[PDB]
Amino acid sequence: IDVVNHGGDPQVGNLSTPINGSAFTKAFINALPAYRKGLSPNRRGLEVGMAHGYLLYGPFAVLGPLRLTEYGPTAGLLATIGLVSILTICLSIYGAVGVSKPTETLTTPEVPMDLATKEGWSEFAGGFLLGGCGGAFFAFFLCQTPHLQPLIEVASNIWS
Amino acid sequence: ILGDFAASFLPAILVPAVGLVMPAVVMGLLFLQIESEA
């Protein structure tokens, strides 16, 4: 029994491995904000930016020049905001150059047609900005309001 | 209140995960499963 097959077309340079496209990776990649069926841009970008802004307040808050200082969480928030702004500028100029239709693979047989235009990628960039700012500020608020929150004591004792 | 048992911080993470996070995930996923057409 060949569990590693092609995608239906063998001469295309890809293989349908269990990791690539079997049953659980076709879903949860087609159900991510990118490649989900019903979402518009400025909603895909909102979800992606919220997740990214939330995760990126982890190596700036406890890993920085100010991490031994009470200004450390605020400096990590400002650094996350700056990185999200730089990434939004990158997304905006990537769209402003001109985008093509995204690459269709075995995992994603249908790519979002709304991201194939410059106007869709501008909405994605704006949603990424608002989401990144919101996620970074939400992670800052969650890390700052108990003022110790000993989950942050974990992975800062590691990153001493 | 943290306990005297080993890894007392794990009730502070798993109990809100199993009581709030993954039931929300399971109801969202099962809602999308039972309400999708075709």
Binding site: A23, F24 | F5, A6, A7, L10
Partner: peptide, 30 residues
């Protein structure tokens, strides 16, 4: 009492029936 590392060892051991329960449930669906 048991150690702190033994709890994390038992958790990553418990991921082995965690994965296999997901694998049985999808094949029981089919």
């Amino acid at each position: 009492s048991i150690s702190e590392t033994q709890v994390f060892v038992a958790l990553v051991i418990a991921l082995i029936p965690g994965i296999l329960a997901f694998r049985l449930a999808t094949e029981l669906y089919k």
